[PDB]
Design a binder for these strands. Structure first.
Ligand SMILES: [Zn+2]
Ligand SMILES: [Zn+2]
Length: 67
RNA sequence: GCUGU
RNA sequence: CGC
RNA sequence: GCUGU
């Protein structure tokens, strides 16, 4: 559960659904995208409510993208 | 740099 | 979010 | 049971 696929329409500035209603990740630009399968690394601490980093390297998925 | 019960 |  | 460019 540590990888999520990025929204292509978000990446080309084009998501009419918006982050809340989109089934794909809308990550921050500082988060590294694996260009081979267009995914981002999920913050596993965040899934458990235990990420306290001021600037985390990984994606914090909204609840609708999880479990 | 986290993922393991 | 062209398979 | 359809929603996705
Ligand atoms: Zn989107
Ligand atoms: Zn985090």
């Amino acid at each position: 559960t540590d990888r999520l696929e990025v929204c292509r329409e978000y990446q080309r500035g084009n998501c009419n659904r918006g982050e809340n209603d989109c089934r794909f990740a809308h990550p921050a630009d500082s988060t590294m995208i694996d260009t081979n399968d267009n995914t981002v690394t999920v913050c596993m601490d965040y899934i458990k409510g235990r990420c306290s980093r001021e600037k985390c390297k990984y994606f914090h998925p909204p609840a609708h993208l999880q479990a």
